[PDB]
Amino acid sequence: SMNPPPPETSNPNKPKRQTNQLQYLLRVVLKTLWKHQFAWPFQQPVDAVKLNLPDYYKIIKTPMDMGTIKKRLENNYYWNAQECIQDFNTMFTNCYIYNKPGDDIVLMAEALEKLFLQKINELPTEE
Numbered sequence: 407s408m409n410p411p412p413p414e415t416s417n418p419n420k421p422k423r424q425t426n427q428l429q430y431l432l433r434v435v436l437k438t439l440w441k442h443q444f445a446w447p448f449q450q451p452v453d454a455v456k457l458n459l460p461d462y463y464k465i466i467k468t469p470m471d472m473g474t475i476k477k478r479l480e481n482n483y484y485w486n487a488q489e490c491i492q493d494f495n496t497m498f499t500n501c502y503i504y505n506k507p508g509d510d511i512v513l514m515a516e517a518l519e520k521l522f523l524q525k526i527n528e529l530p531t532e533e
């Protein structure tokens with residue numbers, strides 16, 4: 407049993423730029439979620455080998471995690487905020503698909519998502 411390669415966090419062929427929205431996503435949104443007490447299961451790719459979840463990457467074919475998102479932001483991998491927002495949504499959705507509703511990990515994800523949505527409502531206008 408093996409893990410897939412993690413999602414890419416840089417690509418020399420993918421155009422990049424900075425925007426105040428992407429800055430906010432790193433400095434406020436990611437930062438808030440990253441330091442939250444429920445962040446830890448989401449701070450790196452799911453290690454299915456270690457967790458003995460041999461079915462994880464059979465069920466989840468679009469993995470995503472905040473470690474990857476953090477590196478993507480730091481590496482200026484994204485062109486726009488919606489790409490980053492999509493990654494957070496993929497991360498939450500994977501949890502809700504793989505785990506049973508009501509499991510603690512689902513409650514942790516829901517708490518993080520609630521907080522995420524609050525911060526996204528406060529996204530600044532593009533400069």
Ligand SMILES: COc1cc(Nc2ncc(F)c(Nc3ccc4c(n3)N(COP(=O)(O)O)C(=O)C(C)(C)O4)n2)cc(OC)c1OC
Pocket residue numbers: 446447448452456457458459462501504505511
């Ligand atoms: C409920 O299923 C999920 C569980 C998690 N849990 C989850 N997410 C992230 C973790 F870091 C983590 N730590 C963890 C959890 C269980 C563990 C171990 N570590 N280690 C320690 O590894 P290290 O030696 O310290 O490196 C082990 O050695 C064994 C004994 C194999 O059991 N668990 C995380 C999930 O999604 C993000 C899950 O949904 C897929």
